[model samples]
Target: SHMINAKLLQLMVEHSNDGIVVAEQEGNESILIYVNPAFERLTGYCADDILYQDCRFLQGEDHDQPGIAIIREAIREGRPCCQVLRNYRKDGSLFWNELSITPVHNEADQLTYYIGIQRDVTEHQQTQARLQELQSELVHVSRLSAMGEMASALAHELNQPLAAISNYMKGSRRLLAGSSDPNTPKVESALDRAAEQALRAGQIIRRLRDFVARGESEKRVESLSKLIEEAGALGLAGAREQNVQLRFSLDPGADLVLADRVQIQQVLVNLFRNALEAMAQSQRRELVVTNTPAADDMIEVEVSDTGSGFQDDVIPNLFQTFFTTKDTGMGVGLSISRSIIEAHGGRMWAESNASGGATFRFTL
Candidate 1:
């Protein structure tokens, strides 16, 4: 009965869900001596194929990884260790392995073998990576929402240049009507200038559309001044519709920032529109935008509005995703804006201004 019990215990270990490996401790290396059926199923390698070889064969191309170093040091000292490692199966497929190994000793306390336990964690790692990608995509979608919010004003912004082109051409026609030389150089010059302005307008519209499109977050060295100006222009129409005055105080020297231009621009636009809407019904309606140097080699941007400051509960949920005060709001703009700012190694927050209003501030 004792012998039968011993065999039953061995069988249980062999049939366990977690891969079990036993290796001989030979001269600073652990040589594979036994592997259970679970090990074969997890790694796609039969016991015979890996027997007598170093267990490092499982490391595949990631032999120099930090986990390998940790394991090596532990093995050198004849101690136990645990780590998550990227490993390869017999068929070359990569897997994340939650691996734990321990040195086994006899009655004399001399290490004779190493026992390894491995559980595949590939699904967990893949889920984490996908979560990051989804968060990034949410930032892009928030930008598109900001643009869509100001679409009517954007159309009007383009119309201003088209209307100017129309008037200039009409003026050129009138000059041509009175001239004996209808193709006068001066008339041609004015028309040429008008066409140039028309092209400029088209370029502006194309740039706006490009900014509105869904794109991956790409960081680059950008100008704070340019970012501020572009964001103001993008939100101009919406602000005008609400009769909100936007005041700018940008320090000329505070121009450089390492950031994703579009993402930061989205942050600016979101803040601008939010401030405008907040002050829509206020007796004193003004939006103040400022960029200045902050301590610790960072740039600070402030968007302040003379509107009703936050309610008691608003502050806590201000940056929470899918949390919004307005019925029509998707509630993602502020949330994604905060994420973009943080991803650029910055911080974003809001405070009530001293003069009965709110101020949204971010530093980068």
Candidate 2:
């Protein structure tokens, strides 16, 4: 025989794992005419029930998929097309359907039918997604490790001079204190302040090193209330001196966040210390920190203080490193704190209250 018999050809088509669909192109629609047993098994739709219907029902509610556009364009021009579509089965189970469609022509070269081949590649697509995520995580970890190395090296190199400056200031202040000249006694106070500033500079370096080290760890889900309370333990160490009224309006819905605990605590600690220092001389010192749920799956944390709120012009410059309006501030704390917030894919800003205070707002 020139070709295989009908029964043997039907068996070949029916036994295939890939779904085979033969559709008639009637009035701009791909109507199902012949579906093999494989197609029935794949879509959970029998030939008798699905015949004479458009073949787009497998996509269900997702009509706006990126692949749908290309498929429609191909059908309109009578061209073959292939696409991977997000398809929902009859039982609402999701599957990535790899569909290859071919436009068939009659003897006069006129389009008449379409042949669709569908393969369920859900497992393969899931594995590809997982691999991409793992690769990104690996890349992130590698970069952070390198950053940690550089930070440790710089801290070691910088700490030597910081220590020397501190020691020289201490020695000079003591020698000036022993002087009989009135101006020399005045120099002693200046040198004493120099020594304090030097020590403070060293503390900043240590904090920087710690920040890099702690940031290397993977961020985990953390309790917002617990972090606030724990950070307050160390940051608000001097809350009793001014009798600063402490208040917290923590929302239960916004209690959990994905972040590095130590890094977040460092920011909170810096803000609390800044607030307390600002209110040290105020008549009615009060500290209020609130957490609220915000749009886009974010949590808003605002720390407000009844202290000497900075001028509007200077407020924008407050976060610059080594720039401060305070007498003793080295001006690195806010800058460092802002960087920490940004590292966690968050935003931070400072604003003066309408009445007479300042608020440090951040989104997590």
Candidate 3:
């Protein structure tokens, strides 16, 4: 009768959603004494194979140090701990498992067994991973688009000094070729002008490079105000070319943030260019870019347009995939934008203006 009751208890343990395991107390070896059917399913291991085996065998090479350290400390002290842990299965599949381990003690307070319960969270982890990838790709595309727009602006910016340099070189050559004294003050003055123009071109190239260079390998503190200014510069010429005005009101006290500069610039440029496109059809086209305070001393970025606002029908699904109001839009901008902000410990949202236009705000 006692044996039959033990079998029933084992059956109840095997079929649960959480993986359950028992190990020897004194040796600290994961003695997989009794794993419910749920454990077999979650770990890809049969009960027969893992029985009396150390549970640490499931902690694969990819496990994070901090998490494993905490678990080890809890087990050593004979305390209970619930945490998210990464482990591998029979076929060498990696997964995130939410696990709880508790020490079972007898009436004398002597440790008898260690019980570990695990719940698979692989699906939730995959979803979060996909969101992060999409967000990164979106930022890359947005940065490239801004670079495309700024190419023409950079050309215009560099043209004046280059043209001046060419003129000075030609004039100096002519003066020297002519019987005019080769070392005359006029020739020297023209040469000096040419040198100054060369320096000006160099400065422009350096600044433009600073704006777009992907310095992903470097760890540096960046200023939010500088990022916004460069992004505004990128879109300013596009606005002017379209006979629209782009305005900026920056927070003088915007804090310096730790981030990849190019990626940060890309985020800002995307928001600004999106605002420009929103106001494209309006006769009173204008863009308002503002930076203000956010919670926890973080910063908030706002980009507003003076044109067609959000489509009312798309409110609930605004950040959803494959949904768009514009003919050419891929319906992924805002969705990706939100994910990027969230990844950086920030948030992005949109609000429709009653008078007119749409407002995009991001906090980081």
Candidate 4:
């Protein structure tokens, strides 16, 4: 019975449904090493055309780098990594190559041969790209709206210091006029308070200017601690001016991550500004931010606000474009923030805090 099944086994190997290939162990200069007829039919190139070439020749210019890096790193370490990379045909046409490659080892742990299995994923690749572009556009739109809401809050925030400064000056002038009165001495104290408030107001304007200068800076690997400090300062100042309060916490050993320094800061600034505004009407206005490491070797930052929680209906729709729970909200900030995070191979999410507030969090 075993002898009789030999030919059938050969036939199945030659014509089976997926593209399979084997390579020599000594030098990866692969030979047809057994490409089934299915491989020949899927790729116009017959076994003879690729009998002695490295499989990488199929990879094209637009292949996914992060995915490729993962695979190559695994191979270098002799570990297994499955990923989809772009490939090219003998005619130099592009295709998405869904593939996994593995190394075979002997009893002595000596590497023997390698096997690669591949399939066409062009349709899937195109679909994924289209969906990514769509999501990015939607995020952009949401950010614009969120920015509008922040603008109004910023105006109101700026006005507070301005009004305080005005009152301080006016009080100082009136006190100076009645120098003969005991209240004359109080004029100096009022003037000093006015100067301090004016300086405080000046700091707010500077922070806003820094936040808005998004496109002016070049990208670099930034220290998360420094970035958090800047964002927290912005929150503290904004809250102080608005008579709200803020507290921030960061992991003592947070790892530094690669990022566009300006864009990342802008995202945090936007979230902090939004939280400040959201809490404006609450009797207890507070914002808190914390950072921690996450699974998959990622980092996370969370911003929470104790104010009127989002409407129950809009809670599930947090990152949806144009979704808003506040009357002044533009509904784009969270969406754009998500894009910025995802484009970096990260994720963002939002939830109603158990402590009676809203929490927006992201990973990078």
In order, the Cα lDDT scores of the candidates are 0.79, 0.80, 0.71, 0.70
Clashes of each: 0, 0, 2, 4
Residue-wise C-alpha lDDT for candidate 3, range 295-353, written one tens digit per residue: 88788878777878877675568777546777887665565566557767777788887
Residue 298 lDDT, candidate 1, scale 0-100: 96
Which window of 10 residues has the lowest lDDT sum in candidate 1? 148-157
Superposed on all Cα atoms, the candidates' RMSDs to the truth, in angstroms, are 18.1, 19.9, 16.7, 17.2
Overall local distance difference test of candidate 3: 0.71
| Residue-level lDDT tens digits of model 4 in 1-364 | 4765888977877777878777655553434466777777667788877876666666656555687778667666777657887777777777777877887776675655667777888987885675565446435644653564465456666777687777868766765875687766666776777677777876776676556534332456778877665545443454556777667676777758767654676677678777777777777777777889889887888888886677678677877766776688667777667767876778888888876788988887
Instruction: Give stretches of model 1 more than 4 Å off.
Output: 1-5, 147-364
Model 3 clashing residue pairs (backbone): 14-36, 14-37
In candidate 1, what are the lDDT values of residues 1-364, reduced to their tens digit?
A: 3656888989899889999888887786789988899889989998878898787888877877899899989988879999998989989999999989998776675658888998999998986675455447546666576564355246656788688777878777776766777558677777877777787877777677666655566889998887776566555457656777768877888889999866776677677677777788798788887888998899898888899888767887888766777889867677777768887888999888876899888899
Task: Give the TM-scores of the predictions, in the order they appear.
Answer: 0.45, 0.52, 0.45, 0.39
Question: Model 4: what TM-score?
Answer: 0.39
- Native-referenced Cα lDDT, model 1: 0.79
Q: Rank the candidates by lDDT, best first.
A: 2, 1, 3, 4
Better of 2 and 4 by lDDT: 2
